[PDB]
Each structure stands twice: as C-alpha cells, then as structure tokens.
C-alpha cells in the first residue's frame, strides 16, 4: 500500500515562482476519478493562472535542495537511547557495542538508535520519486479509457519527459 508506505514522509513543497503561494505535492494526480488533474497542472492559488509545469527548472532545483537536506540529516548521525527514562541524544557513536548496537553512555544498559534511520531516508527518496512517476501513476488506473483520455489531455511526450526528469532528480546524488 502506497498511502501507508509514504505516510511519514515529508511532502514536497515548492512556492509558485509567480504568485508566491506554497504548493504541496504528494501524488502525480490531484483530486479524484473524473476531475482528476495532474497536481502539477495548476497552482493551488486560484487567482494564479501560472502552471507549475512551466517552472520545471525551479522544481528540479528545489528537489535538489530538499534531497541534500535529507541526506545531510541522515549523515548527521543523531542517536537516541531507547530507554524512555534516559533518551540521551548524541552524535557521537560509542565504540562500546552491546548485542544490539551502540551502548548508551548515559545509562549503561540501553542501546542507542538512529534518530533518522536509513530506512526512513530511503523511503523519503522513493516518495520524491513516486510523486513524479507519471508512467506508474497511469498504470495504476484500471480502464485504458480513463488513462488514455488523461494521457491525451495532459501527458504529451514533452510533459512525460518533464516528469521523468524530476523523477530522476534523485540520482544526481
């Protein structure tokens, strides 16, 4: 299940280069069934007629900014004690390991856990890739009619290229 898999992930935010309002993205599509439009089709501010698809360059630059932030957050290495009564927080990995990992140096009977785990970082990157994987969001449509009406209406070969680009912004890093 995609909704729960990316439930704790941070949503991609990027302010309209024109009106200035912050747009939030969590899926390729915005809305449901028939009135479904690619989230990147229109600004969220109704008095802004600029299409985010016009500022693909600014979005890619923002994704890079964000992705850097996450990778740096992971590498900061904050560790926190699993004992509720200790909760010692440190960036110093202790060389003294117990059977399940670093031994908290405050209380000496609990293991230190990564504050931002590698599994959280990996899920976050997969999310940033999922919200721009147009081909996949389309294959997740049952009827080839619903898809192709949509594919013909918004997903031109060029727009599909724009999405592929954003979707792969991930591996530049």
């Amino acid at each position: 299940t995609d909704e729960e898999k990316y439930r704790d992930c941070e949503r991609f935010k990027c302010p309209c280069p024109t009106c200035g309002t912050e747009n939030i993205y969590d899926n390729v599509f915005d809305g449901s069934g028939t009135d479904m439009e690619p989230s990147l089709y229109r600004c969220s501010n109704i008095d802004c007629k600029a299409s985010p698809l016009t500022f693909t360059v600014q979005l890619s630059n923002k994704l890079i900014m964000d992705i850097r932030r996450f990778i740096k957050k992971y590498y900061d290495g904050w560790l926190i004690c699993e004992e509720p009564t200790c909760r010692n927080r440190t960036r110093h990995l202790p060389l003294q390991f117990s059977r399940t990992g670093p031994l908290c140096p405050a209380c000496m009977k609990a293991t230190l856990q990564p504050e931002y785990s590698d599994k959280s970082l990996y899920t976050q990157l997969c999310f940033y890739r999922y919200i721009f994987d147009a081909e996949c969001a389309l294959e997740k449509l049952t009827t080839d009619h619903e898809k192709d009406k949509l594919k013909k209406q918004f997903f031109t070969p060029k727009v599909l290229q724009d999405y592929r680009k954003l979707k792969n912004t991930a591996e530049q890093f």
């Binding site: 850097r68 590498y75 290495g77 960036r91 202790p94 003294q96």
Partner: protein, 442 residues
Amino acid sequence: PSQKYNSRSNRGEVVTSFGLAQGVSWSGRGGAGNISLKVLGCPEALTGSYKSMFQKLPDIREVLTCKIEELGSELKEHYKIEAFTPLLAPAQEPVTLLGQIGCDSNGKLNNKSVILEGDREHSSGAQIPVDLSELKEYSLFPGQVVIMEGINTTGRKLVATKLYEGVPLPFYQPTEEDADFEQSMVLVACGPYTTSDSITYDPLLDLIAVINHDRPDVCILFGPFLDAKHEQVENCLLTSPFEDIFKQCLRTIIEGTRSSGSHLVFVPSLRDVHHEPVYPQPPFSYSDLSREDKKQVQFVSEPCSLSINGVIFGLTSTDLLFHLGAEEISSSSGTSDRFSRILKHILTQRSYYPLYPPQEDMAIDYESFYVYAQLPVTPDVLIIPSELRYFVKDVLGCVCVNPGRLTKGQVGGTFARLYLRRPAADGAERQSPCIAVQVVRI
C-alpha cells in the same frame, strides 16, 4: 549589486609574504616545458567488496576502531611503549592508555569534560574521564588519537601525567628525476567567486584576468562555484538548473584562460549545490571539453593529495581549521600560536579531517573516508583555505597556506601564489621545495 567589490582600491595588494618572495617574478612559463601532475593515494586492502549505500553503524564503528588501533600501533613502536593497559583495569602504578579523545556532552570540549574512549582490541571500547589538573602541557580535540600516561587506581578516571606528542608521517622521498624539474609557479584560490548580493561573478572574472596576466603553470581552484549558501541559490530564485549554472562557471574559466597555458585543477566543495553532498567527494563531472582543453583541465576529488613537479600538495576545500579550532582546548602559558597547533594536529593525525564527531552538517561516509581521506605522507605544501584569516605557516617542515576566500560577503577577498623548485639533493635533508608564497588581494 557587487558595487562595493568593484569599487575596492586594495586590488593587487600583497598581504602576506613567505620565503624569498622577492627574487621571483611571479610569472610562470605558462604551458612551457615539463609539467607533471599526478594524483596520489593510500592503497588499502582491508575493506570488503560488498558495500551498502547508507552506512551501517557497525561499519562506522569499524573505521573508528581501526583509526585508533592503526595509529596506536605506530606510536607504540615509535615511543617503544611496552604495553597498553585496558582503560578499565585499575592499577597502582602508572599506566599507558591508548584511545580517542572525546567530550562527555554534546557541547564544546573543556578541561573538565575530556573523556578517553579506548580501542576495541585493548579496552573493548570503554570510556573513562580524564583529569588534566596534573598535566602541564596539552592540546586536545574530539577525535584525536592519543597515548596518555597517568594514574588510574580505581579504573574510573585517569589522572594524566603525560600526553605523548603526535608523530607525523615521513615526507615524500624524491626520485632523481624530480630534482630535474624547473621552477613552477602555482596559483591557488577558493570560492565563493561572486559577492553575496550578486550573481555576476565579478571576482571570478578578475581572477581570470590575473591568471592570463601572470600565466601560472598550475591553478588550483577550490569550490564552491555555485554556493549552496548563497541567498539566491538557497531560495531557488534562479531561473536555470543548478547543473547548468555550474557548467557555465566552469566554461567561463576553462575558456577564459585558454591563452594562458595554465593547467586548471578543480577541487569540489561540500557547498557546491549541484554536487554529491557527502565527504569525501568524487571529482566533478564535466565532459564539454575540446581535446585541447582536456590536456589543460583536471578534476580531482576532495580531499586530494596532488604531486606537482615532484612536490606533494595536500588539498582540501573543507574548513577543517575553523572546525577543529572551535573544538580544541589547550594549556601551556600563552606564547602559543593557535593555528600552528591545529595544523600540527592535522599533520600528526594523518587524516584530512580528524575531528570526530565532525562539525554538525558535515556529512561523512566513514567507509569512504577510511579509503580516500587519509594523508599518504606529510605534504610539502598544504592548502587549507578557511574562513579564518589568511596565512602561511611552516609547521613541521610543511608550508601551510590558507589563501582565504576570494570573496567575503560583499567585499573582495584574496588568493595566493607559490613558487616551487626542489633543491640540490645533499645536506640536512629537508629543503622545502616551496621557495616563496604570497597572499594577494583580488
């Protein structure tokens, strides 16, 4: 924009001089003759062949233990220590302990918070506080591998009485051919290359003019080229991809300096927004090069140990000085030069980034660090550009240059030029191949 910078009047001013700075026209032969640029390395055969893409704590632990154990093994041989005692073993007689300095909190290290974390091999990684009240002299920082002597009667505290001094690596031993190199002039510069209020890169253009005029043999340019901390980069106000702006910057330099015949050496920074943010960093990727330019341009990693005409250069764009300086504690009298102490630590810890944990926001892949960020030898020249004031100091026989940044805020910065020529073979060995250095204002 860049108003203040372009109206400066200090242009060309020599703010620091080292060696026989006079007696050398700061002109290189350009592309002329034999210019030999070789990237150095520290071989390794300890690391396994299956790596994950996100570090596992057990792996970091491994790298840190080896750091202690490996250096300790050398120090033990040098100072002919007989045995290392486990940190937790109590004794009435003085003991010699091997470990990594650390702080007992998340704050700044102070003479009351020092703890010594032992290696796994002898102490199973245990920690014990260290009392420095009886220690006459000391310079310590978190991450520092040290050998201390003292009394630990209860096994819960070491009253240090002696702190062995760091031992540097030997210098590179030149072959006979290396003595056959002619004088070379090397220019060094570090970003930012644009004032904090503009994206006109006026300072960069001025530096390009300098390169063409002085026609140095080699130019070592440190990033950031497209600074992640620049107001306009951070706010994503730019209207072009980061990668494209980066390539343009590179193009301007490569093209704008074609006529000079100088070999360009680009060193990445953790602030280069378009590039891999984890340290150590791999070389930039730039393919838009003629076949001529390819013989004039080189992309190295960060850090990098580079041999220029037989002279070994230690190169790092990371502000290790500022980071280490903010965490070091000392005590002697007060006739001590802070930077010389910090530079001494870099040369005695054998790493391009000995501080651990690192400054908060410096991302380090420790398994890569282990393989690519060690010092192969004590360099002849160490280029450590920092936010700290520019300088040129001779430390343990190594000329350490901090050319400062080319741009500081909205004001002009500085860059530096070195003159090299390895002297005649015999005599009291060390004859620094670096003859003179100058830090000039852009």
